[PDB]
């Protein structure tokens, strides 16, 4: 009973394992997507045709799931870490951060 939106989430590395393979940063703001995909999917949910069709079918046949609230735009962050040979390395990491969310 609240719709697809982005939600805050900070991922602390020490706090989950990778304290000691990742020199920098110690964490980063990842965000995540969650919420209802109701009928009708509004404009700001950036739905596909498939998802709009599926929402209508779910409303007539409940064995077919509703669309899911998921990231529709992600961005990169770079990290400093030590690898499988253990050199200190700078690396871009793709699709780390949720920039916006939609019903897909």
């Amino acid at each position: 009973k609240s719709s697809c939106k982005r939600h805050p989430l900070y991922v602390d590395f020490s706090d989950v394992g990778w304290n000691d393979w990742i020199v920098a940063p110690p964490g980063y703001h990842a965000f995540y997507c969650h919420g209802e995909c109701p009928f009708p999917l509004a404009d700001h949910l950036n739905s596909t045709n498939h998802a709009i069709v599926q929402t209508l079918v779910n409303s007539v046949n409940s064995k077919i799931p509703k669309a899911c609230c998921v990231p529709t735009e992600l961005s990169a962050i770079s990290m400093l870490y030590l690898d499988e040979n253990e050199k200190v390395v700078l690396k871009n990491y793709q699709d780390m951060v949720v920039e916006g969310c939609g019903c897909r």
Binding site: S3, K5, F39, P40, L41, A42, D43, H44, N46, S47, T48, N49, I52, V53, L56, V57, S59, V60, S62
Partner: protein, 93 residues
């Protein structure tokens, strides 16, 4: 694409950064009346994207809960929609 050109009122379906209960879109404004899972009836409204709008504005006619959706395409036009529940059906089916 095709840029948002339309301004609609919203209630229940407002974007999370909506200013004063309006929303903008390249699609249609809508109003919808429906029963939820408890047979409580509610009226909500907002913006629909252009892509997929044929399907959503037309609806399917026999969903689990009674509803009626209406669409229009001029500024703030959804403040005039007064959609009404479909007549109820008697007998099993």
């Amino acid at each position: 694409d095709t840029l948002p050109f339309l301004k609609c009122y919203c209630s229940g379906h407002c974007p999370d950064d909506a200013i004063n209960n309006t929303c903008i879109t390249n699609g249609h404004c809508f109003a919808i009346i429906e029963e939820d899972d408890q047979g409580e009836t509610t009226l909500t409204s907002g913006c629909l994207g252009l892509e997929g709008s044929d399907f959503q504005c037309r609806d399917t006619p026999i969903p689990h809960q009674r509803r009626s959706i209406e669409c229009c395409r001029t500024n703030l036009c959804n403040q005039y929609l007064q959609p009404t529940l479909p007549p109820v059906v008697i007998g099993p089916f």
